[PDB]
Write a protein that holds these residues in place. Structure first.
Motif, PDB file in Angstrom:
ATOM      1  N   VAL A 164       0.832  -1.193   0.000  1.00 55.07           N
ATOM      2  CA  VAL A 164       0.000   0.000   0.000  1.00 55.07           C
ATOM      3  C   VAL A 164       0.873   1.251   0.000  1.00 55.07           C
ATOM      4  O   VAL A 164       1.700   1.447   0.889  1.00 55.07           O
ATOM      5  CB  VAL A 164      -0.959   0.025   1.210  1.00 55.07           C
ATOM      6  CG1 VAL A 164      -0.243  -0.417   2.478  1.00 55.07           C
ATOM      7  CG2 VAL A 164      -1.573   1.406   1.377  1.00 55.07           C
TER       8      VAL A 164
ATOM      9  N   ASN B 283     -10.186   3.948  -7.178  1.00 55.47           N
ATOM     10  CA  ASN B 283      -9.237   4.660  -6.333  1.00 55.47           C
ATOM     11  C   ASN B 283      -8.274   5.505  -7.153  1.00 55.47           C
ATOM     12  O   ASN B 283      -7.989   6.651  -6.809  1.00 55.47           O
ATOM     13  CB  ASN B 283      -8.451   3.680  -5.465  1.00 55.47           C
ATOM     14  CG  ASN B 283      -7.345   4.356  -4.683  1.00 55.47           C
ATOM     15  OD1 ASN B 283      -7.575   4.895  -3.602  1.00 55.47           O
ATOM     16  ND2 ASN B 283      -6.135   4.329  -5.227  1.00 55.47           N
TER      17      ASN B 283
ATOM     18  N   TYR C 147      -2.577   4.867  -2.785  1.00 55.56           N
ATOM     19  CA  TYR C 147      -3.880   4.691  -2.156  1.00 55.56           C
ATOM     20  C   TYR C 147      -4.370   5.986  -1.518  1.00 55.56           C
ATOM     21  O   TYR C 147      -3.642   6.633  -0.768  1.00 55.56           O
ATOM     22  CB  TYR C 147      -3.819   3.578  -1.109  1.00 55.56           C
ATOM     23  CG  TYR C 147      -5.104   3.384  -0.338  1.00 55.56           C
ATOM     24  CD1 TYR C 147      -6.225   2.839  -0.946  1.00 55.56           C
ATOM     25  CD2 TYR C 147      -5.192   3.735   1.002  1.00 55.56           C
ATOM     26  CE1 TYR C 147      -7.401   2.657  -0.245  1.00 55.56           C
ATOM     27  CE2 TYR C 147      -6.364   3.555   1.711  1.00 55.56           C
ATOM     28  CZ  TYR C 147      -7.465   3.016   1.082  1.00 55.56           C
ATOM     29  OH  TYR C 147      -8.634   2.835   1.782  1.00 55.56           O
ATOM     30  N   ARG C 148      -5.609   6.356  -1.823  1.00 56.53           N
ATOM     31  CA  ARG C 148      -6.195   7.585  -1.303  1.00 56.53           C
ATOM     32  C   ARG C 148      -7.406   7.287  -0.428  1.00 56.53           C
ATOM     33  O   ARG C 148      -8.441   6.844  -0.922  1.00 56.53           O
ATOM     34  CB  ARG C 148      -6.591   8.510  -2.454  1.00 56.53           C
ATOM     35  CG  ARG C 148      -7.286   9.787  -2.020  1.00 56.53           C
ATOM     36  CD  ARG C 148      -7.668  10.633  -3.223  1.00 56.53           C
ATOM     37  NE  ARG C 148      -8.315  11.881  -2.837  1.00 56.53           N
ATOM     38  CZ  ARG C 148      -9.615  12.003  -2.591  1.00 56.53           C
ATOM     39  NH1 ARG C 148     -10.410  10.947  -2.685  1.00 56.53           N
ATOM     40  NH2 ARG C 148     -10.120  13.179  -2.248  1.00 56.53           N
ATOM     41  N   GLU C 149      -7.276   7.534   0.872  1.00 54.40           N
ATOM     42  CA  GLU C 149      -8.360   7.260   1.808  1.00 54.40           C
ATOM     43  C   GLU C 149      -9.551   8.180   1.581  1.00 54.40           C
ATOM     44  O   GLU C 149      -9.408   9.273   1.034  1.00 54.40           O
ATOM     45  CB  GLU C 149      -7.873   7.391   3.253  1.00 54.40           C
ATOM     46  CG  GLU C 149      -7.662   6.063   3.972  1.00 54.40           C
ATOM     47  CD  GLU C 149      -8.960   5.345   4.316  1.00 54.40           C
ATOM     48  OE1 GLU C 149     -10.048   5.835   3.945  1.00 54.40           O
ATOM     49  OE2 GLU C 149      -8.890   4.282   4.968  1.00 54.40           O
TER      50      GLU C 149
ATOM     51  N   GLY D 153      -8.230  -1.578  -8.067  1.00 56.12           N
ATOM     52  CA  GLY D 153      -7.849  -0.221  -7.723  1.00 56.12           C
ATOM     53  C   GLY D 153      -8.189   0.804  -8.787  1.00 56.12           C
ATOM     54  O   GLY D 153      -7.550   1.851  -8.868  1.00 56.12           O
TER      55      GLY D 153
ATOM     56  N   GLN E 220      -3.367  -5.544  -5.493  1.00 54.96           N
ATOM     57  CA  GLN E 220      -4.158  -4.326  -5.608  1.00 54.96           C
ATOM     58  C   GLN E 220      -3.286  -3.088  -5.790  1.00 54.96           C
ATOM     59  O   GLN E 220      -2.294  -2.905  -5.089  1.00 54.96           O
ATOM     60  CB  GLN E 220      -5.050  -4.156  -4.379  1.00 54.96           C
ATOM     61  CG  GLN E 220      -6.086  -5.254  -4.209  1.00 54.96           C
ATOM     62  CD  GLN E 220      -6.968  -5.038  -2.996  1.00 54.96           C
ATOM     63  OE1 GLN E 220      -6.521  -4.521  -1.973  1.00 54.96           O
ATOM     64  NE2 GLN E 220      -8.229  -5.434  -3.105  1.00 54.96           N
ATOM     65  N   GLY E 221      -3.665  -2.244  -6.744  1.00 60.81           N
ATOM     66  CA  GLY E 221      -2.964  -0.998  -6.980  1.00 60.81           C
ATOM     67  C   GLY E 221      -1.844  -1.109  -7.994  1.00 60.81           C
ATOM     68  O   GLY E 221      -1.473  -0.123  -8.627  1.00 60.81           O
TER      69      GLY E 221
END
Ligand SMILES: Nc1ncnc2c1ncn2[C@@H]1O[C@H](COP(=O)(O)OP(=O)(O)OP(=O)(O)O)[C@@H](O)[C@H]1O
Ligand SMILES: Nc1ncnc2c1ncn2[C@@H]1O[C@H](COP(=O)(O)OP(=O)(O)OP(=O)(O)O)[C@@H](O)[C@H]1O
Ligand SMILES: [Mg+2]
Ligand SMILES: [Mg+2]
Length: 861
Positions: free
Chosen positions: A620, A670, A858-860, A667, A839-840
């Motif tokens: 992440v 996101n 990753y962007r919360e 992802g 993921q991503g």
């Protein structure tokens, strides 16, 4: 004629009370090297004098023939034991040799006279060739001794000069007893050269030979018949064999009872005798007389010069080849205070130098030039073991701040045992493909860093850098001498062809900057011609083919096939790789328990910074670690690549569009929110506006700004938002007569640029796709303010490559990303077919730099 005891002929009353002082007394010139062997017909003892003819009689060398049951074995024992009881080891040494597994000299070990007992050579046949050089070396040793000591000509001149009134070391005469030389020459006929040389030199060198055989044929004595003065003929097999060694067939007619024989010398008549025995007891009005004698004589006198050394059977350990190792202060478990600590020298094994009558430790000079190490050998030859020794050896003479190891275990997975060493930083197995690329990428980056920094600083060579850090006042790169280890190079250039040329260039310029490669494979031919020559230090073992060898074709063939650890030293000598242990046990079956204890010792002895780990792509990646808008500018970072872990940007001033494929929950949404949020922070609503097509409604978090113009969650609302923006962008279309300056400046229209963000494109690409009308504007999207940002699922993406919208986006070489998916869809973008990715993660495809594996952020919320 009964049989007499040797103690009787030597005038010894009490055998159980021998005094070596009164046995090895200085004998008269005649009685030197003259002992009784038995009695003749009359009853007089028969003496054998092996001195040269010029001094005594019966010449320097002789021959003995006797078939089975003639007591040939017992005669040889009697002759040797008698000489031992009449001379000190100071003036006489033996070399007892039996070609076949005869126990003739069994028990002679205790005597200080015996330098070597070489038994059973018919089996390990190459030992004959070693024995050749071991004796050939003795001939030269004795000669150079006579050239050096003074400039003497013979041992006799040397010896009494020494005893006259001079200070010299005692040099004893050498008696060589070779049994079964007949079936030895019929095995290795080239060995006869040694015999001839002895007959040419042995007299002056003080080397006396005695050739004994069960049976003989006349051809065997070619060029030897002259040098063999005395001849002892026991009961022979044939009449002719009796003749070729005596001149008469009389030995054929000798009684079947053992002990009887003849003795011929020069032109003087035969003398039939009967040999004495030593393998019996003695009586009065159990144990043999041999044992009783040797028991008392053993341990007395100067120990002999070793002519023959233990011929490479049991391997040594690292503590055996190194000074006492101790837990030092801020230096770890090492040879504390040793001159050769941290000199980039490593001990690997034990080289056999039989000619020089010694065995050397094998040392490697990785301090430059030969800093690159290569290892070859067939299956189960001992490679993977060799590597572990070299690493451990360096680990013992260096601190983790001085050396670092990064391994690619492609040969057995055995390297994983050293993973807990403070000197190693990474051990990648064949199943960890991600760590394999990074392990090479990390070193590649360090090389490029040192390539620039060394010139910036006052560092002329790697030797200087090592010297700077040695002061303990310099940090540098955080690295010392880095070693990249690959266990099976063949496996590497198959599963990872890209890394072949990568690691190759590491070797091509790494030594000057302290980067070493340690590569191993099966055959040298498996190394390309370009990189094989870069391996300065080559450690060759037993190959599947003796040719293709890098030392000697011939020698390579003589390397034991099924004896692991054996090899061929660069100078062309046989050696045996040591074991990566410091315990002392030399047993290969308890190697696993041994290695684990060594690593435990080194780690616990080191209380400082360990080897730097190989940093990899994060599972992440926080968007906060990406460069800010105030740093990047209008460019928008979306993540970092695997190549150098540096940010990957999207510049909508160069290429207007972007496209991303990926399976469910990879992802996509996101990444879309990430890119969008980047546009917010870098553009004002009068510079750029947004319109969203989000059927799944995943983009609410970023559609609240003032840039927001249209948001569609339905097909109706979508196509409605297409109609008004079509006519809008159509208004910005270039007039026909525009000057090139007007075109590149976009003067004819004003306003903001439009970013069309479309999520889940597969759900909007129905039979009646709302995005269809804009397909004709996408090529002209540069002259206007249009931008397409599209995400699509993985299913049926391959066939969607022909849709008007996507087919033109791909055609105009827009930047793209291919995330997790399957190969059923074929090549979507770039030169890599999709597959299961975390993921991503995805493959970033750009017109320049091409295809590149990256990790998105990753962007919360
Ligand atoms: N110098 C040595 N002395 C004694 N035994 C050894 C020596 N070198 C290797 N061996 C033994 O040989 C076996 C195989 O060693 P190693 O794995 O190094 O060979 P390899 O050629 O790497 O095998 P592969 O080709 O299958 O990878 C080990 O179990 C070890 O006990
Ligand atoms: N850049 C990233 N790095 C690591 N994990 C991520 C990243 N982006 C998303 N994820 C994880 O993946 C999961 C799904 O993310 P996302 O909503 O982007 O998938 P999606 O592409 O929308 O798939 P779907 O369309 O089926 O919902 C989330 O739980 C999130 O934790
Ligand atoms: Mg291996
Ligand atoms: Mg989604």
């Amino acid at each position: 004629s009964a049989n007499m005891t040797l103690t009787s002929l030597l005038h010894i009353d009490n055998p159980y009370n021998l005094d070596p002082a009164v046995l090895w007394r200085p004998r008269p010139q005649r009685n030197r090297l003259r002992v009784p062997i038995g009695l003749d017909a009359d009853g007089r003892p028969l003496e054998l004098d092996i001195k040269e003819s010029a001094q005594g009689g019966m010449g320097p060398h002789g021959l003995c023939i006797g078939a089975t049951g003639s007591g040939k074995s017992e005669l040889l024992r009697t002759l040797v034991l008698a000489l031992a009881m009449t001379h000190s080891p100071e003036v006489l040494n033996f070399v007892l040799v039996d070609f076949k597994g005869g126990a003739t000299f069994l028990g002679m070990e205790g005597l200080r006279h015996v330098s070597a007992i070489i038994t059973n050579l018919e089996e390990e046949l190459p030992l004959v060739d070693r024995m050749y050089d071991a004796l050939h070396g003795e001939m030269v040793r004795r000669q150079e001794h006579l050239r050096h000591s003074g400039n003497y000509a013979s041992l006799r001149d040397y010896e009494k000069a020494r005893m006259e009134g001079a200070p010299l070391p005692p040099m004893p005469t050498l008696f060589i007893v070779l049994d079964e030389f007949s079936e030895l020459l019929s095995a290795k006929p080239d060995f006869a050269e040694l015999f001839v040389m002895i007959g040419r030199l042995g007299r002056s060198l003080g080397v006396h030979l005695l050739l004994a055989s069960q049976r003989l044929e006349e051809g065997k004595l070619r060029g030897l018949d002259t040098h063999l003065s005395y001849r002892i003929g026991l009961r022979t097999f044939s009449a002719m064999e009796s003749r070729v060694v005596l001149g008469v067939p009389d030995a054929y007619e000798l009684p079947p009872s053992p002990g009887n024989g003849y003795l011929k010398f020069a032109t003087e008549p035969l003398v039939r005798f009967k040999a004495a025995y030593v393998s019996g007891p003695v009586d009065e009005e159990s144990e043999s007389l041999f044992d009783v004698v040797v028991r008392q004589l053993a341990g007395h006198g100067p120990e002999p010069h070793q002519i023959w050394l233990p011929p490479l059977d049991v391997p040594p350990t690292l503590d055996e080849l190194l000074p006492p190792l101790s837990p030092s202060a801020a230096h770890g478990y090492t040879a504390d205070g040793w001159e050769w600590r941290g000199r980039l020298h490593a001990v690997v094994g034990l080289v056999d130098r039989p000619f020089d009558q010694r065995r050397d430790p094998y040392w490697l000079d990785l301090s430059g030039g030969a800093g690159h190490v290569g290892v070859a050998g067939g299956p189960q030859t001992g490679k993977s073991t060799m590597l572990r020794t070299l690493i451990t050896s360096l680990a013992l003479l260096h601190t983790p701040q001085e050396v670092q190891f990064y391994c690619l275990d492609f040969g057995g997975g055995t390297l994983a045992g050293l993973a807990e060493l403070p000197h190693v930083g990474s051990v990648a197995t064949r199943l960890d493909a991600d760590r394999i690329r990074r392990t090479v990428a990390e070193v590649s980056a360090l090389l490029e860093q040192r390539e620039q920094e060394f010139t910036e600083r006052g560092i002329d060579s790697m030797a200087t850098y090592r010297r700077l850090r040695a002061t303990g006042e310099y940090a540098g790169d955080g690295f010392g001498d880095v070693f990249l280890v690959v266990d099976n190079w063949l496996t590497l250039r198959q599963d990872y062809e890209a890394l072949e040329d990568s690691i190759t260039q590491l070797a091509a310029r790494g030594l000057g900057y302290g980067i070493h490669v340690v590569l191993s494979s099966n055959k040298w031919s498996e190394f390309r011609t370009s990189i094989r020559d870069l391996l300065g230090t080559k450690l060759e073992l037993r190959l599947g083919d003796p040719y293709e060898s890098e030392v000697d074709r011939k020698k390579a063939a003589n390397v034991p096939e099924n004896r692991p650890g054996r090899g061929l030293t660069r100078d062309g000598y046989h050696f045996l790789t040591a074991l990566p242990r410091i315990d002392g046990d030399t047993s290969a079956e308890t190697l696993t328990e041994g290695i684990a204890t060594t690593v435990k010792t080194i780690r616990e002895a080191w209380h400082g910074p360990t080897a730097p780990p190989v940093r990899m792509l994060p599972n992440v990646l926080p968007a906060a670690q990406l460069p800010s808008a105030a740093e990047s500018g209008t460019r928008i970072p979306i993540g970092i690549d695997e190549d150098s872990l540096s940010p990957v940007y999207l510049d909508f001033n160069t290429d207007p569009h972007f496209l991303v494929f990926g399976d469910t929950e990879c992802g996509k949404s996101n990444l879309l929110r990430l890119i969008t949020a980047g546009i917010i922070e870098r553009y004002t609503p009068q510079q750029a506006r947004l319109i969203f097509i989000d059927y799944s409604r995943s983009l609410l978090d970023v559609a609240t700004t003032e840039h927001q113009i249209g948001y569609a969650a339905s097909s109706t609302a979508a196509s409605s938002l297409v109609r008004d923006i079509k006519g809008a962008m159509e208004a910005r279309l270039p007039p026909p007569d525009l000057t090139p300056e007007q075109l590149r400046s976009r003067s004819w229209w004003t306003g903001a640029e439009l970013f069309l963000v479309v999520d889940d494109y597969e759900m909007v690409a129905t039979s009646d796709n709302p995005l269809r009308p804009l397909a004709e504007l996408l090529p002209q999207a540069r002259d206007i303010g249009l931008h397409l940002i599209i995400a699509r699922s993985m299913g049926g993406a391959g066939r969607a490559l022909y849709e008007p919208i996507i087919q033109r986006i791909k055609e105009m070489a827009s930047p793209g990303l291919v995330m997790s998916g399957n190969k059923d869809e074929g090549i979507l973008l770039g030169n890599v077919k999709p597959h299961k990715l975390p993921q991503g993660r995805g493959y970033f495809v750009e017109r320049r730099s091409g295809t590149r594996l990256i990790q998105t952020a990753y962007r919360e919320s």
